[PDB]
C-alpha cells in the first residue's frame, strides 16, 4: 500500500508543515487545498511536482530536492526519512492530527510502513530510485 507517491505525499505534508515564508493560518488553508492528493490515486513525481507548483510555489522545490536526496542516498535515507516524520507529529506542535484526513494518513502510511518485510522495504526504495529517476529522465 505504501508506494513512492504516498511518501512523495508524506514529503509534502512534512514540508508544508515546516515552511518559514508562510503563516499557520495560510498553511491550515493550504492542508485543505492538498486534501485530494492523500485520497486520490498515485500519479507520476512530474504530474505531483506540477500540482505543488500551483498552490505552493515555494515548498514544491523543496519536495522534488528532498525525494531527489532521498533516491541519490541510501535505503537508511528513507527509513530515516519515516523516523523523523513519526517524531514531528502530535509532539511538536503539540497539535492532536488523529481524527483529521492528514492524522489518518500519516497513521496509515506509518503503520502500513512498519508491519513491512525487510524484502518490501527494499523493493520500496529501489521502486522510489526509480520514481525519482523517471522524472530526472524527463527532456523538459
Same mark, same amino acid.
Given at each position: 500500500?505504501?508506494?513512492?507517491? *504516498?511518501?512523495?505525499?508524506?514529503?509534502?505534508?512534512?514540508?508544508?508543515? =515546516?515552511?518559514?515564508?508562510?503563516?499557520?493560518?495560510? =498553511?491550515?488553508?493550504?492542508?485543505?487545498?492538498?486534501?485530494?492528493?492523500?485520497?486520490?490515486?498515485?500519479?507520476?513525481?512530474? *504530474?505531483?511536482? =506540477? $500540482?505543488?507548483?500551483? %498552490? %505552493?510555489?515555494?515548498?514544491?522545490?523543496?519536495?522534488?530536492?528532498? $525525494?531527489?536526496?532521498?533516491?541519490?542516498?541510501?535505503?537508511?535515507?528513507?527509513?530515516? /526519512? @519515516?523516523?523523523?516524520?513519526?517524531?514531528? /507529529?502530535?509532539?511538536?506542535?503539540?497539535?492532536?492530527?488523529?481524527?483529521?484526513?492528514?492524522?489518518?494518513?500519516?497513521?496509515?502510511?506509518?503503520?502500513?510502513?512498519? =508491519?513491512?518485510? /525487510?524484502?518490501?522495504?527494499?523493493?520500496?526504495?529501489?521502486?522510489?530510485?526509480?520514481? /525519482?529517476?523517471?522524472?530526472?529522465?524527463?527532456? @523538459?
Amino acid at each position: 500500500w505504501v508506494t513512492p507517491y *504516498k511518501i512523495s505525499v508524506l514529503v509534502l505534508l512534512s514540508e508544508m508543515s =515546516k515552511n518559514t515564508k508562510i503563516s499557520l493560518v495560510e =498553511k491550515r488553508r493550504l492542508n485543505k487545498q492538498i486534501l485530494p492528493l492523500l485520497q486520490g490515486p498515485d500519479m507520476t513525481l512530474s *504530474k505531483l511536482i =506540477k $500540482i505543488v507548483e500551483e %498552490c %505552493c510555489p515555494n515548498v514544491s522545490s523543496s519536495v522534488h530536492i528532498r $525525494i531527489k536526496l532521498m533516491a541519490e542516498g541510501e535505503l537508511k535515507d528513507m527509513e530515516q /526519512f @519515516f523516523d523523523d516524520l513519526a517524531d514531528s /507529529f502530535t509532539g511538536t506542535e503539540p497539535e492532536v492530527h488523529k481524527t483529521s484526513v492528514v492524522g489518518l494518513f500519516l497513521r496509515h502510511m506509518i503503520l502500513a510502513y512498519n =508491519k513491512l518485510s /525487510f524484502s518490501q522495504v527494499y523493493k520500496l526504495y529501489t521502486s522510489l530510485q526509480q520514481y /525519482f529517476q523517471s522524472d530526472e529522465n524527463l527532456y @523538459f
